[PDB]
């Protein structure tokens, strides 16, 4: 039955992101809002741990229960938490989040509940950037905003 | 397999609270510390929602999958999220969290992953106050600190 999750992002950028899933087997629909982003593409990933003891750093790496290399959302090889990029059209504006993903879930082994959503400083190169961080982080640089993913009402 | 959860408080008071569970059948040991509490007892509860969109208010009521009355942790009738009181020995000091509970879990229906740990302004009367509010909130009053319970490493 329908599950909802929510994430309150804070840091250099901020906003609230929602996760909706109709049933166990359906894709997770990501909606909501990120405000204050610099114009351009920003890496948008679910990280392994819901640990905020050391800023966004203690979130660890991208959520990766299948133990794969980094990729884009449509890559054959990807981390479960690989949600690609969100793109700010202009500076200091409000960016709408609109993603549908079949790998992340709000139930089971791929559940993102109690993990961390992280917005990065730089574009995610989808594992195709050719340099050494590309197959782990997408070379998406620093962690500009994060929050723990919580269970939400209705 | 052993599980760990963590919660970083945000509000009038600070602290990091940890949760440990050896098996799915074993109790949860709650550890860590809260800094800055006023002298006396303070309500200490897991609330239903890991929703931080409106501070600690959007967390909903005490986590209560059985829909029972409020109680102390040792009361026969209680909410799953009823962890009683954390007590500050003096003003503006360090309060040790040291709890073992058989009702909260890090797995299954009573899992507190992705929910919210809340510290209240007033003592929890453990459902023994003689009225309806007592049997609902323990009359623990305002929500002075909270954070989402996230998954932790090892
Ligand atoms: Zn990745
Ligand atoms: Zn209660």
Which distant-in-sequence residues (6+ apart) come within 8 Å of A5 by Cβ?
A: A18, A19, A106, A112, A113, A149, A150, A151, A152, B50, B114
Give me B55's structure tokens: 């501070």
Which residues of chain A make contact with B6, given a CB cutoff of 8 A?
Answer: 50-53
| CATH code: domain of residue B126 | 2.60.40.200
- The dihedrals phi and psi of B137, each to the nearest 5 degrees, come to -120, -10
Look at B147 and A114 and tell me if their CB atoms are within 8 Å: no
Which helix or strand (DSSP H or E) is residue B135 part of? helix B134-137
**What is the C-alpha radius of gyration for chain A, rounded to an integer number of angstroms?**
14
Residue with the two structure tokens 């305002």: B142
Look at B51 and A153 and tell me if their CB atoms are within 8 Å: yes
User: In angstroms, rounded to a whole number, what is the distance separating the alpha carbons of residues A85 and A82?
Assistant: 9
- Going by DSSP bridges, is the β-strand pair B150-151/A28-35 parallel, antiparallel, or unpaired? unpaired
Give me B41's structure tokens: 């007892």
Q: Which of A50, A53, A116 to mutate to test the interface with B (most CBs of B within 10 A)?
A: A50
CA separation, residue B116 to residues A72, A90, B29 (Å) = 32, 35, 17
Which distant-in-sequence residues (6+ apart) come within 8 Å of A76 by Cβ?
A: none
Residue B51 forms contact with A (CB below 8 Å): yes
Burial of B33 (0-12, 13-18, 19+ CB in 10 A): middle
**Quick one: three-class SS letters along B57-111?**
HHHCCECCCCCCCCCCCCCCCCCCCEEEEEEECCCCCEEECCEEECCCECCCCCE
Ligand 2 centroid distance, CA of A104 (Å): 32
Q: How many angstroms separate the CA of residue A35 from the nearest CA in chain B?
A: 15
CA separation, residue A32 to residues A28, A140, B67 (Å) = 13, 21, 31
Cβ atoms B79, B44 nearer than 8 A: no
Angle at Cα A132 formed by Cα A127 and Cα A134, nearest 5°?
A: 20
- Going by DSSP bridges, is the β-strand pair A28-35/A94-96 parallel, antiparallel, or unpaired? antiparallel
Resolution in angstroms, to 1 decimal, for this deposition? 2.0
- Going by DSSP bridges, is the β-strand pair B99-101/B28-35 parallel, antiparallel, or unpaired? antiparallel
Candidate list A42, A62, A78, A115, residue with the active-site label: A62
Which distant-in-sequence residues (6+ apart) come within 8 Å of B10 by Cβ?
A: B52, B145, B146, B147
Q: Look at chain B and count its residues.
A: 154
Give me the residue from B48, B51, B148 closest to A50, CB to CB.
Answer: B148
What's the count of helices (H) and strands (E) in chain B, helices before strands?
1, 11
Give me B94's structure tokens: 């360090």
Residue span of the structural domain in which B87 resides: 1-154
Which distant-in-sequence residues (6+ apart) come within 8 Å of B54 by Cβ?
A: none
> Which residues sit opposite B8 in a β-bridge?
B16
> Is B79 marked as binding a ligand?
yes
Cβ atoms B48, B64 nearer than 8 A: yes
- Closest of A58, A59, A44, A52 to residue A121, by C-alpha: A44
3-state secondary structure (DSSP) of residue A46: strand
Which residues of chain B make contact with A51, given a CB cutoff of 8 A?
Answer: 6, 8, 150-153
A131 a catalytic residue: no
Give how many domains chain A has, as a whole number.
1
User: In angstroms, rounded to a whole number, what is the distance separating the alpha carbons of residues A131 and A125?
Assistant: 10
Interface of A with B in 100-139 (CB under 8 A): 113-116
């Amino acid at each position: 039955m329908p599950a909802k999750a929510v994430c309150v992002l804070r840091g250099d950028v901020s906003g609230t992101v929602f996760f909706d899933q109709q049933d166990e087997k359906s894709p997770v629909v990501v909606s909501g809002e990120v405000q204050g982003l610099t114009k351009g593409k920003h890496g948008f990933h679910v990280h392994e741990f819901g640990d905020n003891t050391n800023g966004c750093t203690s979130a660890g790496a991208h959520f990766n229960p299948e133990k794969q290399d980094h990729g884009g959302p449509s890559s054959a090889v990807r981390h479960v938490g690989d949600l690609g990029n969100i793109e700010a059209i202009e500076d200091s504006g409000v960016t709408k989040v609109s993603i549908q993903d079949s790998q992340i879930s709000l139930h089971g082994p791929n559940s993102i509940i109690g993990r961390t959503l992280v917005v990065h400083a730089d574009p995610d190169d989808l594992g195709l950037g050719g340099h050494e961080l590309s197959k782990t982080t997408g070379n998406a640089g620093g962690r500009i905003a994060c929050g723990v993913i919580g269970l939400a009402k209705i």
